[PDB]
Write a protein that binds this ligand. Structure first.
Ligand SMILES: CCCCCCCCCCCCCC(=O)O
Length: 90
């Protein structure tokens, strides 16, 4: 896991994460790839920190979009999309 790969995976989620609505196929696919790549505790902690960085790019981030993404994509998300998560607890 690198932050560049996290950014690539989550890029198609940016409109949903910033405007609400539904994630869409490309976003759900991106998140499933990420979730697939966060296979170890280290990978998960690393991904968590990169996702937190990404989430903190957008002053207009919709936290409830972020919170609804796993249910809308049908996945158990190992690394939640959050601006404030402490990644040590992942
Ligand atoms: C369970 C994941 C396998 C699906 C692989 C690509 C799916 C992309 C569209 C995602 C929509 C959610 C599907 C689902 O997990 O039920």
């Amino acid at each position: 896991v690198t932050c560049g790969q996290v950014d690539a995976n989550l890029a198609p989620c940016v409109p949903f994460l910033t405007q609400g609505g539904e994630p869409g196929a490309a976003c759900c696919s991106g998140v499933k790839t990420l979730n697939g790549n966060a296979q170890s505790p280290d990978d998960r902690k690393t991904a968590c920190n990169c996702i937190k960085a990404a989430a903190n790019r957008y002053p207009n981030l919709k936290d409830d979009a972020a919170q609804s993404l796993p249910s809308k994509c049908g996945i158990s998300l190992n690394v939640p999309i959050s601006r404030t998560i402490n990644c040590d607890t992942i």
